[PDB]
Design a protein around this ligand. Structure first.
Ligand SMILES: */C=C/C(=O)N1CC[C@@H](Oc2nc(Nc3ccc(N4CCC(N5CCN(C)CC5)CC4)cc3)c(C(N)=O)nc2CC)C1
Length: 300
């Protein structure tokens, strides 16, 4: 493609303060914390990831940081910098309310059509931006969208995201453990991932939400998923979903990838629906100097 002039920032440990922990194991510890640039007279809420040395882990995380640095959008969670302590740390924008998946679950009784539809839009928007940056997320899930505010969600955790090389339209992945129930078929069959691979995962993500955090193909062993999809079976229609919404989800689960909708179409469609939420989704009755990361832009 063109030169990637993303800026990568290196930060001092003394520059940021850990306040508490928001989950830890299986990776390392993610801390709530605050980062204060040296002269700036501002304090920025952040999430700090300190790796659980093992060279392998440092490699992985730096790759994560490489990806985040290479993206700037309102709808993609922002990466502030990295710290080269003994244990490498990744500083990123803090989304106070946690993953959307857990969020929808804890609040079924309060999420309304407006909230849901808007979210669908915000993610389509976020994702479409990654399409622009020639990026294949490869692990789009409700668990990987985090909530900045109830009105604002952002995509994050690019554990498996990959940036397409130039004149490269598919990514072929060596075997590893991967989200199965979220994956497109081609991805399962041929370990091929594309943006339209990402769309299917988008369609599932919406289903994840419209069921208020249900588990797709619950019970069904991941081993048997490919047969089913090959058979033409798909996820069921959520109770609250008008035909319109669900139809949209289904088109994401078509076998022919160019058959699936592009993200821009998804944005445009959900936006019209979000104009009139209650018609498209049916629900049972409807710190002094702190600056958000989005509002902060680096010196020079
Ligand atoms: C789906 C969860 C998931 O995938 N995890 C695993 C580790 C986490 O990571 C990150 N976490 C965050 N931020 C973050 C902020 C806030 C919270 N909690 C969740 C629980 C909630 N309550 C606890 C108290 N109860 C009484 C009510 C519910 C408070 C908010 C969890 C996570 C971030 C980030 N950028 O903010 N980033 C990561 C990735 C490193 C996500």
């Amino acid at each position: 493609e063109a030169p990637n002039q993303a800026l990568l920032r290196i930060l001092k440990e003394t520059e940021f303060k850990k306040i508490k922990v928001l989950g830890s194991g299986a990776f390392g510890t993610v801390y709530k914390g605050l980062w204060i640039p040296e002269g700036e007279k501002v304090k920025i809420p952040v999430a700090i990831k300190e790796l659980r040395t093992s060279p392998k882990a440092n490699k992985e995380i730096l790759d994560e940081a490489y990806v985040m640095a290479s993206v700037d959008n309102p709808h993609v969670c922002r990466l502030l910098g990295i710290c080269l302590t003994s244990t490498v740390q990744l500083i990123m924008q803090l989304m106070p309310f946690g993953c959307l998946l857990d969020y929808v679950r804890e609040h079924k009784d309060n999420i309304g059509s407006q909230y849901l539809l808007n979210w669908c839009v915000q993610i389509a928007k976020g994702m479409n931006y990654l399409e622009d940056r020639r990026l294949v997320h490869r692990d789009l899930a409700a668990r990987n969208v985090l909530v900045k505010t109830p009105q604002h969600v952002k995509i994050t955790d690019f554990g498996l995201a990959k940036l397409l090389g130039a004149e490269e339209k598919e990514y072929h992945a060596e075997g590893g453990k991967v989200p199965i129930k979220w994956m497109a078929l081609e991805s399962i069959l041929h370990r091929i991932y594309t943006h339209q691979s990402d769309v299917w995962s988008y369609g599932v993500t919406v289903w994840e939400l419209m069921t208020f955090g249900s588990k797709p193909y619950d019970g069904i062993p991941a081993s048997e998923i490919s047969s089913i999809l090959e058979k033409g079976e798909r996820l069921p229609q959520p109770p609250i979903c008008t035909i319109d919404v669900y139809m949209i989800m289904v088109k994401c689960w078509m076998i022919d990838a160019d058959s699936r909708p592009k993200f821009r179409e998804l944005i445009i469609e959900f936006s019209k629906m979000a104009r009139d939420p209650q018609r498209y989704l049916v629900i049972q009755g409807d710190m002094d100097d702190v600056v958000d990361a989005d509002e902060y832009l680096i010196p020079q």
